[PDB]
Amino acid sequence: RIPVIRSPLEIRDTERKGRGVFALEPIPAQTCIEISPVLMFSKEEYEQHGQYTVLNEYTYVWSEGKQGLALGLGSMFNHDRHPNVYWKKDNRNNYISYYTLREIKTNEELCISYGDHLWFEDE
Amino acid sequence: AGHMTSMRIPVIRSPLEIRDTERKGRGVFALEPIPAQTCIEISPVLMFSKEEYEQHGQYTVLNEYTYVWSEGKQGLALGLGSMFNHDRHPNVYWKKDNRNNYISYYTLREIKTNEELCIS
């Protein structure tokens, strides 16, 4: 259901800027670089408790007021105003897939939008 | 003396897959054999303070996934580390890096195609 995606990625973890995902070699546009299984929180447990933790910084809104944390590499992409990675949520199989918006050059950070949204590729 | 730290960590591309299991929910399975003592995953840990875990985090489904850490902290393994089922006869062991907040996972023995990789 979710096998290894052998993308040329590494994680940089610096005292300065924390963690981020960076390209080891060039990557073509529209390449699936990550499929993250999601840890799902019910609306009530997130509203009552989850939102008061560091979860708040990483989760993705989900259907019916649920809230998902992306496992795999998904929580490691930083947010940027000019993102080069976009995502798709899968409600049936509980994952999020990441893709490149354009050609990525080596040493570029992979970054997603600050924005969230609620539609699913499977709907 | 010295400077700020800086690490570049591989995303280990082990031949592993996530599948749903009947009894235990999602689990991690081998797509091909794997030698013993092979590093199959290095998971970044998202850390919860003692206080946010005791007040909030333990009341959520985090409670089912986190690893006890020093000083009443709890770590949630990102990467594949939260996806391994627990088993009485594990074929994977882990080590915590307390300096950097990672967990590394290594095969205890050779793994067969289609075997489920489990920790204790």
Side-chain angles (χ1 to χ4, degrees), chain A residues 1-16 19 33-34 37-41 45 48-50 52-55 58 69-73 75-76 94 107, chain B residues 3-11 13-20 26 31 44-48 52 55-57 59-62 65 76-79 82-83 100-102:
Chain A
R1 257 207 332 99
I2 312 157
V4 59
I5 274 56
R6 298 206 166 72
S7 59
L9 298 181
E10 59 169 9
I11 290 148
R12 298 186 188 180
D13 181 346
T14 68
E15 211 171 289
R16 206 86 212 291
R19 298 162 171 169
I33 59 165
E34 165 68 15
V38 172
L39 181 54
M40 202 62 60
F41 296 71
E45 81 190 284
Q48 295 180 3
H49 292 295
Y52 301 115
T53 66
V54 297
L55 284 171
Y58 297 95
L69 178 78
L71 309 167
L73 291 179
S75 292
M76 315 287 278
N94 267 30
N107 306 298
Chain B
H3 50 78
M4 295 185 303
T5 59
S6 178
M7 307 176 283
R8 306 197 168 193
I9 291 138
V11 183
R13 297 311 189 178
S14 299
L16 299 179
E17 179 173 57
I18 292 167
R19 306 175 188 179
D20 232 320
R26 284 165 302 189
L31 299 167
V45 178
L46 170 60
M47 203 58 70
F48 295 80
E52 72 186 311
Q55 289 179 358
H56 300 289
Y59 298 114
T60 72
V61 79
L62 279 170
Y65 294 90
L76 181 79
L78 309 171
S82 299
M83 294 287 96
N100 304 294
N101 296 346
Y102 287 82

Side-chain angles (χ1 to χ4, degrees), chain B residues 4-116:
Chain B
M4 295 185 303
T5 59
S6 178
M7 307 176 283
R8 306 197 168 193
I9 291 138
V11 183
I12 305 208
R13 297 311 189 178
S14 299
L16 299 179
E17 179 173 57
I18 292 167
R19 306 175 188 179
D20 232 320
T21 74
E22 175 153 306
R23 210 159 18 89
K24 290 183 163 172
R26 284 165 302 189
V28 177
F29 292 81
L31 299 167
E32 71 192 35
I34 302 155
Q37 307 305 323
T38 304
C39 190
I40 52 166
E41 163 72 359
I42 297 170
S43 292
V45 178
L46 170 60
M47 203 58 70
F48 295 80
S49 70
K50 182 182 156 66
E51 184 181 45
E52 72 186 311
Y53 190 76
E54 294 187 355
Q55 289 179 358
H56 300 289
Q58 72 168 324
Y59 298 114
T60 72
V61 79
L62 279 170
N63 190 291
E64 297 175 35
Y65 294 90
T66 57
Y67 286 84
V68 186
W69 218 269
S70 57
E71 287 143 82
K73 299 202 295 309
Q74 297 278 325
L76 181 79
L78 309 171
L80 290 178
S82 299
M83 294 287 96
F84 292 113
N85 281 309
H86 297 248
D87 195 64
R88 287 187 300 283
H89 308 274
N91 56 18
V92 172
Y93 69 101
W94 43 271
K95 291 166 164 261
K96 303 196 269 147
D97 183 334
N98 286 109
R99 181 180 158 74
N100 304 294
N101 296 346
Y102 287 82
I103 298 169
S104 299
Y105 299 77
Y106 308 82
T107 50
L108 281 166
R109 51 189 184 67
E110 181 187 325
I111 305 300
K112 310 158 221 145
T113 296
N114 277 312
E115 252 189 293
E116 188 181 354

Side-chain angles (χ1 to χ4, degrees), chain A residues 47-67:
Chain A
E47 183 273 316
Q48 295 180 3
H49 292 295
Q51 73 164 322
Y52 301 115
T53 66
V54 297
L55 284 171
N56 82 76
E57 296 180 37
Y58 297 95
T59 54
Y60 286 79
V61 180
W62 220 261
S63 53
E64 307 160 76
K66 302 200 300 309
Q67 199 87 0

